Amino acid sequence: FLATTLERIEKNFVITDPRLPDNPIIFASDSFLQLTEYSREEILGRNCRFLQGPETDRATVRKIRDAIDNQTEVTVQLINYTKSGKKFWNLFHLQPMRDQKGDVQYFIGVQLDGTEHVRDAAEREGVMLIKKTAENIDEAAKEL
Numbered sequence: 001f002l003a004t005t006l007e008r009i010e011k012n013f014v015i016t017d018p019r020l021p022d023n024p025i026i027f028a029s030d031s032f033l034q035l036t037e038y039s040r041e042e043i044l045g046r047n048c049r050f051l052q053g054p055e056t057d058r059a060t061v062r063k064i065r066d067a068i069d070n071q072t073e074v075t076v077q078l079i080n081y082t083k084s085g086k087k088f089w090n091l092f093h094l095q096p097m098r099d100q101k102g103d104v105q106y107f108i109g110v111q112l113d114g115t116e117h118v119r120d121a122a123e124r125e126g127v128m129l130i131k132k133t134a135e136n137i138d139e140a141a142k143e144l
């Protein structure tokens with residue numbers, strides 16, 4: 001699956017379609033593929049939960065479930081795994097994308113990878129970056 005211009009935006013993100021069974025990934029940027037080690041054909045049509053593994057905090061996963069069910073934004077940190085099983089920390093931001101009547105049409109997820117759980121200045125700078133990125137992608141996705 002060749003990258004669309006959207007997917008060549010130089011940021012780590014995915015877009016899912018909550019109309020399709022299990023809210024699957026339909027767009028995944030090249031940097032997301034580089035991070036996770038999967039090809040685009042391997043992850044399209046799958047729910048993002050395949051990135052989770054034994055050390056993933058399930059309490060945090062439930063925070064994300066609740067955000068999606070209530071169609072609201074969330075920002076959390078959790079451990080995720082690459083295809084080859086390497087752990088990374090994921091500073092993750094979710095937000096819905098709404099149409100001209102205000103209904104959610106897609107979800108946008110922005111991921112910032114790190115080697116540790118961040119706090120204080122590193123957390124603040126991380127969250128500044130992922131929120132700004134989410135806004136950029138919301139604009140890009142308006143024409144999908």
Ligand SMILES: *[C@@]12=NC3=[C]C([C])=C([C])[C]=C3N([C][C]([O])[C]([O])[C]([O])[C]OP([O])([O])=O)C1=NC(=O)[N]C2=O
Binds near residue numbers: 015047052062090108
């Ligand atoms: C995945 N990012 C991500 C991006 C979007 C836009 C969405 C909608 C979800 C994710 N997930 C969360 C996952 O798909 C799921 O929502 C949760 O596991 C909670 O639901 P379940 O049914 O499992 O309780 C992401 N999960 C990750 O682990 N990493 C991300 O990058």
